[PDB]
Symmetry: C3
Subunit: 485 residues, 3 copies
């Protein structure tokens, strides 16, 4: 009569990596690196504004394509590649900083700045900024001389921020195609604009000259901006070539901005976005895109990092039981992880030990619950996919992102291998612990055969075997019949 101990096993198994070995077949494993993508912008539960053809900066100045976003409000702002910030040819200074400001703004709220004028024309328009006939930026005023070639009077206009949050102030310098046109619109003489506050202090002079035609015009209206603190006053002093602001902008609250090219899905929910869609995953790592934003798994270079969720698969190592003095595993033990297999006059019985199985299962389960977590830290865009940022700061950004990518790749690899080593050694420890427990139960009534079996030197029926398995065996009841050998 004998009672052997063993562990389960499967036919195929799954290879993993450890601290000492590469390609260890374990019974079960799960992936930690996300490779699956939702090719949509999951926007369920979030106020979403798809800008489309309106550029994010245009919402402050107001070209015809931005007429519906002049006072938008959203939790998720989507920039599109076909978006344009300007109707009249030009660009912004410190454009990317303002884009990053508006992505988190949660929307904008315009307020009249109270600029009245006397002695100049205030209805400059163009065929590029076309609404009905010929129009201009909805939030701006193209100030021209009162008549053709007349002298533009020296003016100075101020604005007080009576609110509790800073205001976004944008003005424009007009760059004519020639000095003759600048005199035609503003009169002869040098033109100068001065913008001053308590934190800002800059001056601007236009630059007449020929340029390649953009949208059909060779002039260039450029836009500049500042943040006016509460109770602070902004002052402009100008005598021509000045696009005056009409309404200031105030940030509503909180949001996040992404640049994408896939459709919006209001029935899907997500928190991690990139240009190709939404990354929905509980895994701690992802190998989709290093520039993902939101609450995302850490980007890593590796495509797959299998974490072992089971013992070493030994079909037909610190503690020497699994894949040790126990030659192989039991492919039929589908009842648990560790188990008993007895042979007596009734012969051949296989049961499972619930305590050790549930112990290893609880340990690996706690490990998975520790690794499968959420990073509540949100990251926003500092790069730009449609309009590349400056070369130097872009190289610094790329360098930093690559360094962090190296760090997280290392931490992910080392983490996976280490946890796999501890998993295998842990299951081994549980097998050896169960074996030691049975040896301690039988005491002097049985002997070890070296293969994990116990030679019981007395007669042990199915009730006696069941007495061994549930720790009700009393060695003194057999300490003489068994010890007669």
């Amino acid at each position: 009569d004998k009672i052997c101990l063993g562990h389960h096993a499967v036919s195929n198994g799954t290879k993993v990596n450890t601290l000492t070995e590469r390609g260890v077949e374990v019974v079960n494993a799960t992936e930690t690196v996300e490779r699956t993508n939702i090719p949509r912008i999951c926007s369920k539960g979030k106020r979403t504004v798809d800008l489309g053809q309106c550029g994010l900066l245009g919402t402050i100045t107001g070209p015809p394509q931005c007429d519906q976003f002049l006072e938008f409000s959203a939790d998720l702002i989507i920039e599109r590649r076909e978006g344009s910030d300007v109707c009249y040819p030009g660009k912004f200074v410190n454009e990317e900083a303002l884009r990053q400001i508006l992505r988190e703004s949660g929307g904008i709220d315009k307020e009249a700045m109270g600029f009245t004028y006397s002695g100049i024309r205030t209805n400059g328009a163009t065929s590029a900024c076309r609404r009905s006939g010929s129009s201009f930026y909805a939030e701006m005023k193209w100030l021209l001389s009162n008549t053709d070639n007349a002298a533009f009077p020296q003016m100075t206009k101020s604005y007080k921020n009576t609110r509790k949050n800073p205001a976004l102030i944008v003005w424009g310098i007009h760059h004519s195609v020639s000095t003759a046109e600048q005199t035609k619109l503003y009169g002869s003489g040098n033109k100068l604009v001065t913008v001053g506050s308590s934190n800002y202090q800059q001056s601007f002079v236009p630059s007449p000259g020929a340029r390649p035609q953009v949208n059909g015009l060779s002039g260039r209206i450029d836009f500049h901006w500042l943040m006016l603190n509460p109770n602070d006053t902004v002052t402009f002093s100008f005598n021509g070539a000045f696009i005056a602001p009409d309404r200031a902008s105030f940030l509503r609250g909180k949001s996040m901005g992404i640049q994408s090219g896939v459709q919006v899905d209001a029935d899907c929910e997500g928190d991690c976005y990139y240009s190709g869609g939404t990354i929905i995953s509980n895994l701690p790592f992802q190998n989709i895109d290093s520039r993902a934003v939101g609450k995302c798994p850490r980007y890593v270079k590796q495509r797959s990092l299998l974490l072992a969720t089971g013992m070493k698969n030994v079909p037909e190592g610190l503690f020497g039981a699994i894949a040790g003095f126990i030659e192989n595993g039991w492919e039929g033990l589908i009842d648990g992880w560790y188990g008993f297999r007895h042979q007596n006059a009734q012969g051949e019985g296989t049961a499972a030990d619930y305590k050790s199985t549930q112990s290893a299962i609880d340990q690996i389960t706690g490990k998975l619950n520790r690794l499968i977590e959420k990073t509540n830290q949100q990251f926003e865009l500092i790069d730009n996919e449609f309009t590349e940022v400056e070369k130097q700061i872009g190289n610094v950004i790329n360098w930093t992102r690559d360094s962090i990518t190296e760090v997280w790749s290392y931490n992910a690899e080392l983490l996976v291998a280490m946890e796999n080593q501890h998993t295998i050694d842990l299951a081994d420890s549980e097998m050896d612990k169960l074996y030691e427990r049975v040896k301690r139960q039988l005491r002097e009534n049985a002997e070890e055969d070296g293969t994990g079996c116990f030679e019981i030197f007395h007669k042990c029926d199915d009730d006696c075997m069941a007495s061994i398995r549930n720790n009700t065996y009393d060695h003194s009841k057999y300490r003489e019949e068994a010890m007669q050998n």
Copy 2:
């Protein structure tokens, strides 16, 4: 007659986190994330100059509030929120870069540039820079036309650097409230400035215009600065609207610049500073301020990460602790592991010094390895008072948040891993003591299953003592014990 052996335990332990479980009670644990803060700037043994109402940049130009900091010398420079770089309204170009240059300069040393002026007037003053009545920047001079109008003659002034270290040259451009004021101060037509040294070059045209009233005045004097190399000659070609430099600045040595709002305490000593005070700690992590400077523990998001310094606590890997030994002994106060024998003379409970001192030395080794101090000093690249450019600020915040994530992860994983190996370590020591006793008794005792050894012969107190200090001889009792 039996001899048991076990481990110590306490009623109220300390819950820690491990690689495989959260809330494991251990006997003892220590904190690795610092939270206590000294509400003062510990500056003992350091030359400290509190700028107060004086701005760091003003020390180069010299407003009335910086007349005593014109040649300061310190190891720790402290910027205050009430500081101001100017008395006449204006601002510096590349102000933050110059601030970072002055923070680590160890002070400044001025030297007369030797500018003499024939013709033009050089005593321009204002009611914003008040000393005696109306004064100007002590290191600058306001050049004006000879009379109340007419012409300001074109002039060129050149300075040569006769030092071995670079010099700090700071000049100023004056922006009048209107064209009429510029014509009154310096003359009708265009005003032009030109600064040239090689590896530098620039021209400047003033921009008259109405600015908001700061200190009652609407003009704006904005300051520019270059760094002269040895033997390098700088030349200024101007004809008005030029704030001339009177003395150049030289960097003394090395210091550190912090921005705080708490008082200075020369009683305590510290090397890690921030706005709220001084972080004096030996712990490797801190959750006080992510922008701390100097030699600091690495900032982490977590506010508490308990490191286990004891075994698993079991009140009343290797399977001894919390395994076949059902529980621990709160009475065992002499050590971590011990014996408890039951014979004929009574009951005994002693402690084993080898295993206890072994585990204590091991966990002590972990402690010594973890509470390491980093000799890497980090400088200030942000500004709590005057916010930097939005783009470079977003990049700096982005990098700092990335590093914070890295160190938070490393701290969590380190704590959990060290706790796991600590519990497994103590368990291993218990198992090793048990196996040592088992091999020591040989065939004269048996295992009952709960960490005890039934001795099948009479074993008095001296026999138990022989078992404890490993002087027990099995052949002395083999003949009697074998019969059972």
Copy 3:
């Protein structure tokens, strides 16, 4: 008659650091932090181009020292400290960004813009750019005026990028010594230069003024650059003080840019370069230069981190090594673990191949996993020769120091952890061998406590050999040994 289990040892081991102990002697160890460097630039099979006295930016403008590099092509670009971008005194705007663009460009390819001028001069030369006598930049034209004092007409020359890649458009602004010189060269009045396109706009103006002379000349010709997109059109509207471009530059492919001061060696091959030479190593870390570029081991502050490649050395966690086995056998030079038996035929000592090869395979796996090459190439964002802006330089230095801290911590923790698991691993193997012999002897032998087995029967040499190769039948001797 007894049979003992043991492990090897050496007289003088190597001390390493573990998670719980500093200075643990192990049998063998290997270095993980590289210090040795080849003091040459190993560019075997890379087509190098050593600029020498030519500056990297000059290859776009074409001073006399860059005449042979006007259309260079390479995979590794080496900048020297003696390199100069200019022959006439001047500099570049956004020079560092353009240098970084040219380092990874793989070379440049020039193409004639196709500019034709009328009524003006186009042969402006100088004695500083000395080819035959007085010359100028090969890729530039110095537009002047015919007589000593005429007037530069308002001109506008445009170019259209006809190729499917961006074009580098470098023009120049001339800054004269005085107003009289600028009027002598270009006429009189306010001179302006405008460069427009799709991603660009700007506004350039000269700056006449007194200036110290470099190379005997006080003028300053500065160069500004542009990146036209395919099908994009650039336009220049100028009226004087304009150094016109001649040919445009196109990036050939990809390359690497390093700054070094050592000779070039076409024999050795390397992928990691720094100012001192080439780092040829497979170790995961290096303490040579933190600014090394290419595919390098990660820089760390520590100079040496010894990885344990053997068991703990015990001369004369699982309790076997340095435990109930008192010491190791220096005479066991046949393997890691071995038997030492004593019977009647004499005294024997053999080695066990299973456990030895097992531990060797595990530690070999650790070495194969740690000794790994990083296929991530890092470019040059600093400048050892010219230096960059102070603010972006402080940000770059700050980020680099942070990453260096992270990799130093990870290196320390990695080495200590791997050493801990290695020692515990070999200990585990020894214990497993011991328990295998214990289970193998069944009831015919008894443990002695010091790692040996007292055999209670007569076991000759063939019986010992049967024990060593797992062919010992305990039933052969069970009746004989049971009687004792």
